[PDB]
Design a protein around this ligand. Structure first.
Ligand SMILES: Cc1ncc(C[n+]2csc(CCOP(=O)(O)OP(=O)(O)O)c2C)c(N)n1
Ligand SMILES: [Ca+2]
Ligand SMILES: [Cl-]
Length: 365
């Protein structure tokens, strides 16, 4: 059942924690109140329960981590210096295929649903105008193109320094997210790209140039690859093999810079990434040439949101109290940390294989 650890340390992103604005480090002060609230709630539950009241009260700390690879590798060493961290679901599923049972998934995060994507169970069918994934892309275009993103105001779209609130329905928690495919060009170029998609002409489609993320990204690489493979049946085996033979058609860059590269017209991103990108950023996100437009072509199959995982030897009773502490803090609106990352809710994982692995695998087939 594991060892009771009187000191629990959460791993958090170095970039995030060591982050500041106008020279003011404010993230450190956010996680500080988060930790005070977490400690309070945890030991209250701990002490109110006869099964756990005799263990030592627990202190909570955080430690900054380089990247997810360091997080999963560090957790797998089962060292009490690092007990817990929240990781992207697809990366974790891949990690756990190669190193089964090595770490313990326990918590599932949820996020405010987008108003245009409230139903998880929508999947690729044929990529035509009646495809449910194309229909979500048309809904995105209403929000992002018809009322042009560049003209949104903080007030208009209710920016809260974190996200544009008007694009969300907080009454609905989504235990999922998707990737999406963007296209960009003048009218003639956009029609050509759509024609190549409608005609299933892979070579022409690909030669318009694709921006993508890291090869191990779900939402900026693998989920889009799945859609492309299913849509352009039998025209390539993997994106990596296609790129090897067609290097100039691919570039690793953020979708919000698509408008600045004349040679590229297609980009992968998280669904709705504009929702947490201030349009006033000095980097002019999603900006395009005057006679060009950027629009959504299609979104992807859905996969779970981020998963909280423990090193293996943390006492199981302790793990479940920690999971419940996250749930109650969000419910009591005492979680000052989560929403800064997109976590607006938490659920216990009851069956990892059914709730996480299977959902992910269905999405990428
Ligand atoms: C306020 C806010 N909402 C949403 C996000 C985006 N987001 C947070 S967790 C997550 C799911 C995992 O995505 P990611 O870590 O990019 O893994 P990938 O899809 O690249 O494998 C997303 C899309 C954010 N950064 N901030
Ligand atoms: Ca510890
Ligand atoms: Cl109990």
């Amino acid at each position: 059942q594991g060892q009771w650890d009187k000191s629990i340390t959460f791993g958090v992103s170095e970039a995030w924690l060591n982050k500041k604005k106008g020279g003011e480090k404010v993230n450190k002060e956010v996680i500080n109140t988060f930790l005070e609230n977490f400690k309070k709630e945890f030991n209250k539950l701990k002490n109110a329960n006869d099964k756990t009241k005799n263990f030592d009260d627990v202190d909570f700390k955080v430690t900054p981590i380089q990247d997810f690879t360091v997080l999963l590798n560090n957790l797998s060493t089962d060292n009490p210096e690092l007990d817990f961290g929240i990781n992207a679901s697809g990366k974790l599923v891949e990690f756990l295929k190669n190193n089964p049972g090595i770490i313990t998934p326990a918590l599932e995060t949820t996020t405010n649903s987008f108003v245009f994507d409230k139903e998880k169970d929508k999947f690729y069918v044929d990529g035509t105008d009646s495809d449910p994934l194309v229909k979500i892309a048309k809904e995105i275009n209403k929000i992002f193109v018809e009322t042009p993103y560049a003209s949104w105001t903080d007030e208009n779209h209710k920016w809260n320094g974190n996200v544009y609130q008007s694009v969300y329905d907080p009454t609905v928690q989504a235990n999922f997210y998707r990737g999406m495919i963007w296209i960009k060009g003048n009218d003639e170029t956009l029609a050509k790209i759509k024609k190549a998609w409608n005609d299933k002409d892979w070579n022409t489609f690909r030669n318009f140039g694709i921006l993508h993320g890291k090869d191990n990204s779900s939402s900026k690489f693998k989920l889009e690859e799945t859609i492309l493979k299913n849509h352009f049946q039998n025209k390539f085996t993997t994106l990596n093999e296609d790129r090897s033979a067609h290097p100039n058609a691919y570039k690793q860059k953020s979708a919000d810079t698509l408008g600045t590269l004349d040679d590229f017209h297609i980009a992968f991103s998280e669904e709705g990434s504009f929702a947490w990108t201030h349009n006033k950023s000095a980097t002019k996100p999603f900006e395009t040439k005057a006679n060009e437009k950027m629009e959504a072509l299609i979104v992807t199959n859905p996969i779970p949101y981020d998963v909280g995982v423990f090193r293996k030897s943390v006492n199981q009773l302790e793990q479940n109290l920690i999971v419940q502490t996250f749930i109650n803090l969000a419910k009591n609106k005492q979680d000052t940390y989560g929403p800064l990352l997109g976590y607006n809710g938490y659920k216990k994982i009851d069956n990892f294989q059914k709730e996480i692995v299977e959902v992910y695998e269905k999405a990428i087939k």
